[PDB]
């Protein structure tokens, strides 16, 4: 996250960090004790993934962390159907052992399709992660967060030559300077509704970071809430 602030411990208890061949390479959000939702481009098959919930400072500890191994990965079936489009950029990770819920490990709420869209339409969401704090620069140690305004679709379309599908939305500022960035993918875009947060998007892609005239692009979660609910049922 470029231009954001340090989160306080337990401020975003649904945020998890993913570690693998590269440390802290993407983010994710807790759906329930056994499931994480993230971006499909962070987990294209192969490699071993480790999830850390209750994380705050990647190089310190307050003993709130819970590390789990990923036993199953489910990228949306249409992801990568069209080469290099980033359309359908969402995926689910099943944990080996359930997480124990507490003040530092809490699920993000997920409304139905209609309400997720209404919540997105509120126009202000929070994005968070341990990704780049400067375009082409270092990654964060302490979890970063930033409020980003929704951008009308027409303006979104005109900001880039790449295609913005009905499965994506733009968020950021006309002047730039504040944005999600490399490493923040898979992390959540959330909307707070009277003290309760709902997942409204997934950090997905962009052109560089925080550039004036450009915006961060997010996976539109409302189009995928039925799929999430169907794949993450607990037995």
């Amino acid at each position: 996250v470029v231009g954001g602030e340090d989160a306080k411990p337990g401020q975003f208890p649904w945020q998890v960090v993913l570690n693998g061949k590269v440390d802290a390479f993407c983010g994710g959000s807790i759906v329930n004790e056994k499931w994480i939702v993230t971006a499909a481009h962070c987990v294209e098959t192969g490699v071993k993934i480790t999830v850390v919930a209750g994380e705050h400072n990647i190089e310190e500890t307050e003993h709130t962390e819970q590390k789990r191994n990923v036993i199953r990965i489910i990228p949306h079936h249409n992801f990568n159907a069209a080469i290099n489009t980033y359309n359908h950029d969402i995926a689910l990770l099943e944990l080996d052992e359930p997480l124990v819920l507490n003040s530092y490990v809490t699920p993000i709420c997920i409304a139905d399709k209609e309400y997720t869209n209404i919540f997105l339409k509120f126009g202000s969401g929070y994005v968070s992660g341990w990704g780049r704090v400067f375009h082409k620069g270092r990654s964060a140690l302490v979890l970063q967060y930033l409020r980003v305004p929704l951008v009308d679709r027409a303006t979104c379309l005109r900001s880039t030559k790449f295609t913005i599908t009905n499965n994506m939305f733009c968020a950021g500022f006309h002047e730039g300077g504040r944005d999600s960035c490399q490493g923040d993918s898979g992390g959540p875009h959330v909307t707070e509704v009277e003290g309760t947060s709902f997942l409204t998007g997934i950090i997905s892609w962009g052109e560089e970071c925080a550039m004036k005239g450009k915006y961060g692009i997010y996976t539109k979660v409302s189009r995928y809430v039925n799929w999430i609910k169907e794949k993450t049922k607990l037995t």
Partner: protein, 59 residues
Amino acid sequence: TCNIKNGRCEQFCKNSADNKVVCSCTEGYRLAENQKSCEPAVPFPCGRVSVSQTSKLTR
């Protein structure tokens, strides 16, 4: 009607006979007494911050 102020529902609203409204809440919550607000029904319901942060207050 859910037309205005989401029918006064804290979370979800659905229109009912004669311009009436039925409020509802997400998993982990239950409709409160007023049949408008949403109440925690589990120790750690989704989307809420419970660390309260800091510790300098009445509590």
